[model samples]
Target chain A: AREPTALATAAAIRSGATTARAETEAAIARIEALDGAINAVVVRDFDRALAAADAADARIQAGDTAPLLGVPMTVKEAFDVEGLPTHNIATSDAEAVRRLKAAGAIILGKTNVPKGSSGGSAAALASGMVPLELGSDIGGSIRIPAHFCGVWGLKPSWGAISSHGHGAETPLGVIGPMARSPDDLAAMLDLLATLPMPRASRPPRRVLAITDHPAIRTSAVCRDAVDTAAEALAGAGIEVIRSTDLLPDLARQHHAYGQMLSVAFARSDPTLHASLPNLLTWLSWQDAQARNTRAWGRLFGEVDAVIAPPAATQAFDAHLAWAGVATYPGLPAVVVPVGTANGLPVGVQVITDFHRDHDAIATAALIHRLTE
Target chain B: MAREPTALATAAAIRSGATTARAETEAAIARIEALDGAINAVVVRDFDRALAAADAADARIQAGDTAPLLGVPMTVKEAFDVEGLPTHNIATSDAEAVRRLKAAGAIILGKTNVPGGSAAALASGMVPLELGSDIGGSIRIPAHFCGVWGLKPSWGAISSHGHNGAETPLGVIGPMARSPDDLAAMLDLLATLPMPRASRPPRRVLAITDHPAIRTSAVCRDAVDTAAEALAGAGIEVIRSTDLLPDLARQHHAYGQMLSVAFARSDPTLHASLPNLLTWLSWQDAQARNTRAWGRLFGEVDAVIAPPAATQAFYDAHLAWAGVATYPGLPAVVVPVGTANGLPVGVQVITDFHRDHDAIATAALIHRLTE
Candidate 1:
């Protein structure tokens, strides 16, 4: 009914192990079938996907060199997908879409960016409509949805990838890969990045396990997600440090991050702000942010990564504190579907230091493999 | 006065056994004793601990330990904490940047006056390198006047964890040194951001002999001219202005307003939180715009060249020049081009946000150009 890893699908296509059209048509049928209940893929590009797969088959015969050549995938609804209700029709592919297109990935359609009442991109992967997704996270929409839907999503280091073709050139938000497998996410990231992001030089060892936050208390379920990750790492001879002062004041960080984020968006929507009559207060918030980011670097100095719940109780801005712990500092964070808590997906957010996007992916992969 | 050993050279000599760590520390102490009467820069001396630290460096070196600043003598601005010293401000512990500096084997001789002349300290050869902070024009202006190299890194590029918390947004923990090489050594150890070599050597540098808002001093203009010419001579393109560049007047206005409100006492008439908070918010927002604008300009040009101060002497105290880098949180470097009217004239080299090492690299090229 669904797909394997996008990379695996691409690999099969390239090696003549699987047919490109078969992969594409199967994805279309799966969306047609399951999307009624999941409501993930709200838009479809099946007509163009046929042409892409038809061409991808030719490339497969010629030698499928593109990493994602012949792979069918969807991006978040926020991306401009020409001819599909943007301008109410984007009329052109977003920059992110263009990159994936260049790599031979066929567009199934845009997924639900409903910020997940199960999110479109994450849910599509959960139900196996597609093997991979390209999604963006600013206030944790990408990671949150993926966490909710039991898919892996990455929020790369800030400004590492371009936001140009997206509807908004957001300073905080960035597009990253959401996929079923860590390898699929990493493969997608290789095609998406502006620079070749950092790869893990050695096995990740130390991780800071932080569970408390002032804005949102960790739910018992999310708390166990981190505990499980720590246990698995400790079993592997990797050091999981439970406490450290290297982290910035979490209370100061969350409140300031919220204020700063509000002020940042208020640059366009004055109403969201007419709403701190707010900076002389905004600058202090940023001051704390800038200072906290540097302190965030110090924590990574002592550890390979930091693990926390991507959200608390499948919710909203209150859980944004955990998201802010990494995003506020402009670090790379990847949410790995660690395990289930009473049948709900529990994601352990693997946050790494600056520009270390691949490290987040590699480490999350390690944690997921060990947990399973 | 004999020429002071550069931090790089001092470390090299210690590493190769041409000099001992104790020798480096003791000599700096001797120089501080000899020079502090006139400079008043070494505000608090911790001679015994420094000597003890120097011996520790010697033992580390004997055991084949190698740190970049190993056995190099230095001083920090008075604001930072040093174990068992007054800080001249602190708690009992060594501050974060201080700990990193010590970890890299730097032997701190004492503390300089701050609240400070790490500039004056370096000018008198009290220590070859000094750690300093800048919110306004403090580090660059002093380096301009005193004729040494200074780097006010992209704000928050280095740790300010243990320093005064209030000195943020504009103020950054930075390295001030007698040479660009020393600045690199200390900054490399202290930086929270990785200051990699510019992916490609810089191709285009924008020079500013004329800033729209402020009158440029003739000495400063000459400094900018020579530095630009040096870069051009080396096959780098030197341009004057571009549409991509941010509006100087707008940036200065925002920076000036923030500096006054940040450094000066709040107006008693306004409500405590909202008015000032709103003011800081507007300026911070304005800064983000300028940061973006400058980034566009950096696309066409690798670095921007300008005077750190409109005048080498602070008599005018025109800070419009500093705002060009500060408002955008861009990394900047100041290196002396030559002496003007018996005082030093420095060319300020600024690069895109987070390109700290490129600024250092460009400044190093110009500083060595005349030599």
Candidate 2:
């Protein structure tokens, strides 16, 4: 299966090293070769891609040029492309897809997400169509698919890009990337992060390792792996701490995250809540206060980032009411596969405080680099 | 009998040269000697010292510099000090009366009528002293008996720096003169002319002459006539006619409710039930709504100068109710007596919205000039 590196390929074609017609044929050829087995690339925009590539080449001939000049990019199907059936399926395009076309990004095809992107595993994986899809998660949507597929994916920090006018509540869905490369995960993150990229400030250090989840016990293997990562980071001159006393009752604080999550979930569509009313049941104010007392008490102690296990178990079979309260704080979780156990990848969720996306991103990059 | 030239006399004396300090001082001394029998000037400071002030004033006139009030003699009730005099009849030897006299540019002849200090003391004519009982009706009673034009210039207009008393809720010292014109004149001279440097410019008038006690009688009509004449003389016109029906009784009732609420609210030990407090609070709110409505109805108006009471008849009874109205509003005014009614009358000149205080100051000055 051939999936061209979009930016480099587009740059080469823009330089007249390859003709507009050749770029179009190449993209079609690649889509034909790979899409059937993967079923990830669900729609093809061959005709429009060709037309846009020709126009971009014309503009280049007229001396206008930019990176990604004629690059083809596929959005996840949930994004609306005007006059397109937005069943979040490739069956039709909604308004957002049209705006992408208007901006001159070629539409290769739409990708897959699980139904409503609620659970971790993708629809494609569950249906035995493909190994995985880049799904979204309020709870483990993207991570589970990546684990099941034996691929890599990333769910970005909230509000990092414009999910508005995209038809889907992409801000919540958090357009993640599913690919074979950790580099692809980084590339997808780079795409979402760069449009109005945050200023490069002094980078953050100080890693905190946590493993004992209050509701669930961390396996001995998980604990050792976290400690090893902390040690390796310390050896590399990063301050790493793996003390139980780093912040007290972090497990209790972790439960409070459920309150905010439940409220956010409650405020969504009423019909959805009615269908699964238990999904709407939120943490009471008493529970919230208790959690707040624990969380803020620990949070007051200083730490720039905290690393923990993503889930106690690897990818499991699909279930309707799947939830993990431990990840409720909405910290930027980078699910890194820390090798395999029983042929399943044992992933670690590296988390930083909410809005500290770059800190997590940098740490994830370093860990992936070092682990390799 | 000697007294300050009435406002008319001051203007005339300033225009001419005859109304000298010596002449005014002589008149004041004569009036005190003869009239203290009827109207007590109880807090008498240095009588000879006043003669010295008159002499200095005479020299200023000789130098060809006649001040607006070159030589005017007046008296405030004993509750207010004239420096060397014992204010509030605190002590015969108290020297505060002398200080107040020097500050106010007047001769401190003596303190006037005031009620006796002890609650057990039997009331003397002036002691239950109609002039200075610290009760609203008592002050007006002395004015009626003394046959002198008197006014309780709206509270807070004159500072209490030189006054002496416990400064209870119902006390104010006012000016008393032999004639309405003289009263207006002295008031005008005391008030500084022109607005302060920082104040905004002036506006036109809206006159509210409706009083509840009786329909507009001849005397009340004449008082309105006097006010109209003054405004006309000043080149100002009055507009916006309105009536508050059923007399000032409603306003008085509302005022009582508010006072009760204020007292109860400030002291928790008063132990008012929530429901009862709420009822009083509701009435107070209603009164506020009425005030706002009146304020809005006259929104375009700069000032609404109205009659102080429905009629100047039954001065003692009216003062009791009027006093309640006065304390709550904190409105300021120069009380100019109406020449038609030998009874001491008052005209309330309200200023623009909250600007009544400043307007009152100017009106006081104008009244002093007229007197």
TM-score, predicted candidate 1 vs. hidden true structure: 0.49
Model 1: residues with Cα > 4 Å off, grouped in runs: A115-119, A272-288, A314-316, B1-371
B293-321: candidate 1 lDDT, tens digit per residue: 88889889999989988875522237778
- What's the C-alpha lDDT at position B134 in model 1? 78
**Per-residue lDDT of candidate 2, residues B1-371 (tens digit):** 11223534653574377667676666556434422221223434455766887777677667876455555554445565444556534443423433433343455444554541111010111111111332343443333322233444434434344543333333444444444344344434333332232153234555555554335445544554566556656766556454522235566555444444444556787655434756755765775565565456445555555555445432233543344334444333435443331234445555433454355454553465455
Give each model a TM-score. Answer: 0.49, 0.39
Each model's backbone clash number: 14, 53
Per-candidate RMSD vs. true structure? 30.5, 37.7
For residues A214-285, what per-residue lDDT tens digits would candidate 2 score against the true structure? 666656655665665677677777877765453545544545444455545766867556543253243354
> In candidate 1 chain B, what residue range of length 10 has the lowest lDDT sum?
B31-40
**Candidate 1 on A222-315: residue-level lDDT in tens?**
8888899999999999998888878778887777667667766776885665665353755666576677778888888899988888987743
How well docked is model 1, in DockQ terms? 0.00
